[PDB]
Ligand binder design. Structure first.
Ligand SMILES: CC(C)CCC[C@@H](C)[C@H]1CC[C@H]2[C@@H]3CC=C4C[C@@H](OC(=O)CCC(=O)O)CC[C@]4(C)[C@H]3CC[C@]12C
Ligand SMILES: CC(C)CCC[C@@H](C)[C@H]1CC[C@H]2[C@@H]3CC=C4C[C@@H](OC(=O)CCC(=O)O)CC[C@]4(C)[C@H]3CC[C@]12C
Ligand SMILES: CC(C)CCC[C@@H](C)[C@H]1CC[C@H]2[C@@H]3CC=C4C[C@@H](OC(=O)CCC(=O)O)CC[C@]4(C)[C@H]3CC[C@]12C
Ligand SMILES: CC(C)CCC[C@@H](C)[C@H]1CC[C@H]2[C@@H]3CC=C4C[C@@H](OC(=O)CCC(=O)O)CC[C@]4(C)[C@H]3CC[C@]12C
Ligand SMILES: CC(C)CCC[C@@H](C)[C@H]1CC[C@H]2[C@@H]3CC=C4C[C@@H](O)CC[C@]4(C)[C@H]3CC[C@]12C
Ligand SMILES: CC(C)CCC[C@@H](C)[C@H]1CC[C@H]2[C@@H]3CC=C4C[C@@H](O)CC[C@]4(C)[C@H]3CC[C@]12C
Length: 1195
């Protein structure tokens, strides 16, 4: 075996305790686990086996259904396959759910030992140990045997998930090209990614659909025997708790849905502000986007906070419902005139405890998961019933062939087509873009069926598609593509077809792994790989669609002459080509246009304590956390005292011969119930408020740091990386961490309550509770080191299986051409059961911890049950009833506590990422105490005095010693090769990084004044304009400093007025994302309007119109000269015609101011590097440039 699996050889006890898995933890404690450490899946769990199995039942179901004249039901097929195995796990559900019910009955019988206690009855003591021992076996069933069962019901979901994944991939290969229109590739991946994933969860609780209500009937029958008619008072609260949970849960969903719209609006604006952060800074618009996020955040956080009250009250109801259920029972019980006894009390408390979880959690969750599983099942059935290609389909022959991609009143896509080619004949296909193009080849493949006329083909086909598709796998396999390896032929297609030219190097040999997994090849390599695949498949019919666009022309001749011609001289070849050498080499040419055959013939016709402290001490003062701790402990103290009082009341009743003052005992009992409920909600709401206020503050600080972060930070960090902290990390802080943190500390205090009643009742239990505490701490670490690794392995192995369907579904015509559907299926199965073994580790690692984590819980129950009974003369029925009623509760709480403490830790990593972006470095303050006057650029003189510029501290000097004077209103051109420093001069002038040296503007040193004092008072037209979402008004003036008349006038000057007046909102017309409603040229017209509106005396133009069509270029250039004649203008240009008439040109080379003079005085020096750059144009317009400069300076 490749990776032996110990579960095949495991003894019954070995797999009950998951003892077979211990060596994995030995390894993962020492090393990081890798995919080679995973155990291979069991043979019955292979994706091939599971998917092939379910196809049999689904095939029969489709056959059965049509014989019955009915719709197929995939739910019937799924049941037919799995029902016989999954009902056998129902036997243990009956055994386990009756152990939940029989614990309370034997609890009562051990308590009856204390109620009737006399120390001399040795027979009674022995009988009490029998009840304690049966209570232990019931406890061990719930603790030890539950987990082997729970592993099996989880495998039943994996087997359904893996079988369905195989089925839908097998179908995905078979989809008709019409069905590939009705469905997006992203939707079919969504089946694998989201819908089939529902089947893991459905089988966890599917047995509670029957075991849930059946247990309620059993518990109510026993409560009637225990408590009589008064049991309906508690069961009413249990049952009525179901509609309230569901109804208020639906209300929570409405707020959840209304929150997301503000979240997405915020994140979209975040995407815009981060991507545009460099131009936003140069405009000094951070205050605009600051308000916009602040408003979107206040709306979002209000509904987050309001939604958190429902989740706070949901947890508060789950906490305190146990108190109300037993209150209304025992209030009714005693008012009806039955006295409180300790045995009948704590049997009832335990019976309500047993059934509350099934009624209020497992049964409604079973319904919810089965509801949305059936959604997925029918959703996938719609896909499984999509249309398919005719399932079974040397010459290829075509006459009158007429076909449609879809039937329409339009022209056919291909019509009248008539050609026929014999062994060795080659046809070139020629036409404009969209003329018919690849569709003729698609017709030979049979991807278009004949609607009229006929085609036929005999022998095998090879197909080098226009898109160079390659599957994720070894290059060797990409060439073999499901045909067997042969040394001679494979070496022939790599030696004689000299792939070695670009494969002996930069590829690590031919065993390199191609595709989405990595090593991603350029398109030219894939085309040769696809052609080499075609040569290796060595087909009789041979279709080339576009090898030649991908490879270079030098490779093209080698590729065509030495292989396509010499090897395929007898093979029936069709070649779509634009390289005329191959057109002439063809035996015939087919010319087509818009699906019409124009001409046919031969060419001869022509996380430590610091993170928790900084998370907590960010939304509440430490005085609140003192009061918050008091609410938490008071909630749990009152929770336990509500049960202690009932044992005290039972003890006080026990000594009467007279009656108890029922007003007083029932009155305090009602006060304790009110206390635990009111402290329950108060605790839960204050936690949620403090932690949601913590995310409010951490966001405000994080966002504030991002706007004031220097541009260097945005260059080092990708746009997606910064966005993820605003999308995902703060997402956790807003709506999942405060829930998990409350649920943790809510349950944590429940565990402390359970173990402190036991120590308070039996103080000796604290001695065997220190070994258990130490064991659990080591166990948790010893687990977590391996658990985090298999969690990482599992998450990493998913993306291959989704990626394989995505790329395979993109390559359907290639896959079907070679008939490699079996080979591509096996590749999916290999990826599907690489994950299935990572998921197998996920299931069994979790259950290895849980069985041990429940072993210490069951050990605690045994110590209490037997220590209460060894020390029986010390205790009394109320104390023993209390301590045992609680010990039995530990099982489900302590495992959940530990399963909500790693989620807290795994989410606090997002908090430290949010805190990381809170302490970013800041650029200089936007406004220093020294400020310019309201009229500061009075002359617009700019002086660079020995200016040095670096983009990074300690980076290479990009500007060197640059020293230049720019006179008032002077127009300065900046020219240079790429990297000469043109754009770096702007970054120095706007102080996007701090320049070394001094930049003076109007005698004011630009490094003394604030960044908004400097950046507002200079206008820039960038090369790549950004239009933000929102109104045209907000894109022209987000501060409303200008009147609508001024805005319309500026829009008229840039000729946008008519276009914008035609918009249905005029100035309040909402622009689409990035201004996609406008062309790139139009976007710069908006920027020119921005510059015109600001009326700054300094305008900087950075290669702006080089992205722009000549007519709009002429418009922008004309308007700049007209409107900014009185301004100092710095124009960086690539087209010298646009600046040849400047007053001066700064010439940059390699970051140095090589020349700075009047353009003609430059060109009058024939040795100037301006003159060289002009002569490098190679065009007579260089003379016109020289004359154009000369004619300026006489004036
Ligand atoms: C004493 C014991 C044996 C009683 C057994 C209980 C059954 C009589 C009932 C109780 C809960 C019912 C289930 C409750 C909810 C659902 C989900 C529901 O599915 C949906 O509503 C979503 C799919 C759709 O209907 O479109 C209908 C089936 C099912 C499994 C019901 C099937 C029949 C169940 C198991
Ligand atoms: C931090 C805030 C929420 C205060 C929490 C304090 C509690 C931990 C303390 C305060 C008063 C204590 C109680 C004071 C009095 C009693 C009565 C006492 O009952 C008797 O002594 C008579 C019956 C018997 O013989 O035990 C049992 C302990 C108990 C409940 C104590 C349990 C612990 C309590 C609730
Ligand atoms: C609400 C929480 C956070 C505060 C913790 C203490 C309380 C829950 C109080 C409420 C009722 C109190 C009990 C009420 C009555 C008694 C009986 C009392 O014994 C008597 O016989 C009193 C006779 C009398 O003086 O009238 C001893 C204290 C005790 C257990 C009190 C202990 C403290 C209790 C449980
Ligand atoms: C005397 C015992 C029973 C303890 C009392 C505890 C109080 C101090 C707790 C109980 C409920 C808590 C409140 C629960 C709800 C809110 C509303 C919350 O405001 C909103 O959620 C508004 C949302 C919106 O604007 O839509 C701010 C915290 C606050 C006042 C909490 C502050 C602390 C309160 C008042
Ligand atoms: C398998 C199901 C029922 C859950 C597990 C409960 C099993 C372990 C329980 C259910 C009923 C129990 C029996 C009920 C009563 C008695 C009498 C007493 O002197 C103890 C032993 C004996 C004979 C019990 C043995 C254990 C027992 C069979
Ligand atoms: C909430 C956390 C932080 C601390 C645990 C507080 C609660 C659970 C603890 C604190 C003091 C404990 C009480 C101390 C003494 C007694 C008397 C005993 O004869 C029965 C139990 C009883 C009544 C205990 C019940 C549990 C108790 C109230």
């Amino acid at each position: 075996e490749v990776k032996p699996n110990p579960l095949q050889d495991a003894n019954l006890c070995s797999r009950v305790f998951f003892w077979w898995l211990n060596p994995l933890f030995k390894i993962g404690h020492k090393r990081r686990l890798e995919e080679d450490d995973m155990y291979s899946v069991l043979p019955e769990d292979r994706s091939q086996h599971l998917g092939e199995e379910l196809q049999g039942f689904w095939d029969k179901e489709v056959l059965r259904a049509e014989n019955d004249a009915q719709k197929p039901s995939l739910t019937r097929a799924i049941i037919k396959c799995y029902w016989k195995s999954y009902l056998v796990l129902g036997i243990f559900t009956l055994i386990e759910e009756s152990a939940k019910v029989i614990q309370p009955i034997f609890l009562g019988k051990i308590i009856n030992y204390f109620e009737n206690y006399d120390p001399m009855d040795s027979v009674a003591l022995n009988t009490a140990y029998a009840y304690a021992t049966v209570l232990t076996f019931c406890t061990l069933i719930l603790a030890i045997l539950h987990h082997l069962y729970f592993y099996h019901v989880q495998c039943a979901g994996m087997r359904l998930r893996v079988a369905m994944c195989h089925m839908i991939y097998r179908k995905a290969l078979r989809l008709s090209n019409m069905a590939m229109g009705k469905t997006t590739t992203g939707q079919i991946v969504n089946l694998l990614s989201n819908d089939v994933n529902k089947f893991d969860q459905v089988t966890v609780f599917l047995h509670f659909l029957w075991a849930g209500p059946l247990q309620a009937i059993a518990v109510t029958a026993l409560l009637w025997m225990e408590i009589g008619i008064s049991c309906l008072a508690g069961m009413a609260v249990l049952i009525i708790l179901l509609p309230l949970q569901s109804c208020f849960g639906k209300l929570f969903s409405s707020l959840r849905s209304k929150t997301a719209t503000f979240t997405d609006a915020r994140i979209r604006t975040m995407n815009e502000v981060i991507t545009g952060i460099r131009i936003i800074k140069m405009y000094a618009w951070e205050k605009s986007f600051s308000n916009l996020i602040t408003n979107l955040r206040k709306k979002e956080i209000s509904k987050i906070l309001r939604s958190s009250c429902l989740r706070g009250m949901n947890l508060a109801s789950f906490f305190s419902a146990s108190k109300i259920i037993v209150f209304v029972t025992f209030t009714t019980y005693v008012l009806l005139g039955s006295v409180i006894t300790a045995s009948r009390v704590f049997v009832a408390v335990t019976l309500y405890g047993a059934v509350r979880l099934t009624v209020t959690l497992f049964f409604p969750s079973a319904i919810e998961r089965v509801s949305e599983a059936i959604v997925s099942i029918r959703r996938i059935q719609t896909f499984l019933l999509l249309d398919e290609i005719s399932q079974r389909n040397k010459m290829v022959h075509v006459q009158d062939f007429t076909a449609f991609w879809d039937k329409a009143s339009e022209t056919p896509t291909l019509q009248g087509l008539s050609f026929t080619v014999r062994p060795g004949e080659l046809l070139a296909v020629v036409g404009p873009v969209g003329a018919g193009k690849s569709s003729l080849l698609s017709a030979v493949l049979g991807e278009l069926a004949p609607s009229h006329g006929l085609v036929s083909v005999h022998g095998r086909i090879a197909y080098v598609s226009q898109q160079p598709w390659v599957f994720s796998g070894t290059l060797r396999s990409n060439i073999l593509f499901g045909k067997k390896y042969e040394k001679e032929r494979y070496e022939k297609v790599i030696k004689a077809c000299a792939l070695k030219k670009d494969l002996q190097l930069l590829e690590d040999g031919d065993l390199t792994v191609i595709g989405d997994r990595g090593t991603t090849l350029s398109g030219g390599q894939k085309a040769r790989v696809n052609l080499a695949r075609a040569v290796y498949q060595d087909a009789d019919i041979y279709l080339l669609d576009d090898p030649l666009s991908a490879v270079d022309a030098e490779v093209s001749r080698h590729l065509f002459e030495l292989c396509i011609c010499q090897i395929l001289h007898e093979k029936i070849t069709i070649l779509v080509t634009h390289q005329l050498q191959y057109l002439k080499a063809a035996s015939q040419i087919l010319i087509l246009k818009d699906g019409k055959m124009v001409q046919k013939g031969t060419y001869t016709e022509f996380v430590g304590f610091q993170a928790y402290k900084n998370y907590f001490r960010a939304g509440a003062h430490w005085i609140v956390f003192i009061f918050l701790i008091l609410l938490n402990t008071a909630a749990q103290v009152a929770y336990v005292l509500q049960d202690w009082w009932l044992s005290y009341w039972a003890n006080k009743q026990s000594m009467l011969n007279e009656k108890l003052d029922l007003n007083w005992y029932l009155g305090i009992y009602s006060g304790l119930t009110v206390a635990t409920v009111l402290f329950g909600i108060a605790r839960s709401l204050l936690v949620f408020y403090v932690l949601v206020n913590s995310s409010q503050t951490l966001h405000n600080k994080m966002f504030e740091s991002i706007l004031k972060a220097p541009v260097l930070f945005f260059d080092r960090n990708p746009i997606g990386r910064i966005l993820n902290r605003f999308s995902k990390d703060i997402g956790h802080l807003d709506d999942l961490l405060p829930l998990t943190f409350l649920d943790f500390i809510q349950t944590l205090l429940q565990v402390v309550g359970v173990v402190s009643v036991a120590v308070a009742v039996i103080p000796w239990i604290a001695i065997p509770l220190v070994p258990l505490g130490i064991i659990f701490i080591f166990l948790r670490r010893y687990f977590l080191e391996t658990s985090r690794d298999v969690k990482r392995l599992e998450s990493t192995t998913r993306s291959p299986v989704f990626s394989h369907l995505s790329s395979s579904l993109q390559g359907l015509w290639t896959i079907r051409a070679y008939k490699a559907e079996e080979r591509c299926q096996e590749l999916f199965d290999a990826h599907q059961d690489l994950h299935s073994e990572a998921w197998f580790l996920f299931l069994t690692t979790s259950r290895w911890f849980a069985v041990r984590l429940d072993a210490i819980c069951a050990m605690f129950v045994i110590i209490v049950a037997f220590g209460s009974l060894i020390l029986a003369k010390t205790l009394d029925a109320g104390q023993v009833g209390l301590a045992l009623s609680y010990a039995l509760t530990l099982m489900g709480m302590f495992q959940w506590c530990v399963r909500q403490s790693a989620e807290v830790e795994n989410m606090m990593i997002s908090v430290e990422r949010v805190i990381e972006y809170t302490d970013l470095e800041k650029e200089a303050p936007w406004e220093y105490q020294k400020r310019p006057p309201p009229a500061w650029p009075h002359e617009g003189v700019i002086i660079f005095d020995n200016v040095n510029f670096m983009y990074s501290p300690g980076g290479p000097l990009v500007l060197k010693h640059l020293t230049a004077l720019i006179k008032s209103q002077e127009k300065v051109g900046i020219v240079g090769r790429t990297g000469a420093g043109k754009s770096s001069l702007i970054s120095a002038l706007f102080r996007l990084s701090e320049p070394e040296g001094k930049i003076w503007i109007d005698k004011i040193l630009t490094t003394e004044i604030g960044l908004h004092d400097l950046r507002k008072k200079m206008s820039i037209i960038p090369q790549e304009p950004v239009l933000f979402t929102g109104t045209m008004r907000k894109n022209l003036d987000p501060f409303n400093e200008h009147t609508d008349e001024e805005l319309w006038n500026a829009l008229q000057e840039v000729q946008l007025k008519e276009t914008i007046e035609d918009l249905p909102g005029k100035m309040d017309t909402e622009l689409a994302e990035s201004g996609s409603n406008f062309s790139v040229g139009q976007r710069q017209l908006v920027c020119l309007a921005r510059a015109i509106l600001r009326k700054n005396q300094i305008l900087i133009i950075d290669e702006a119109t080089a992205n722009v069509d000549p007519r709009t270029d002429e418009l922008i250039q004309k308007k700049i000269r007209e409107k900014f004649a009185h301004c100092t203008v710095l124009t960086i240009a690539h087209r010298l015609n646009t600046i040849i008439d400047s007053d001066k040109i700064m010439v940059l080379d390699s970051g140095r101011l090589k020349e700075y003079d009047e353009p003609y005085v430059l060109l009058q020096n024939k040795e100037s590097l301006f003159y060289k750059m002009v002569q490098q144009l190679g065009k007579a317009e260089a003379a016109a440039l020289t004359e154009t400069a000369k004619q300026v300076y006489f004036k």
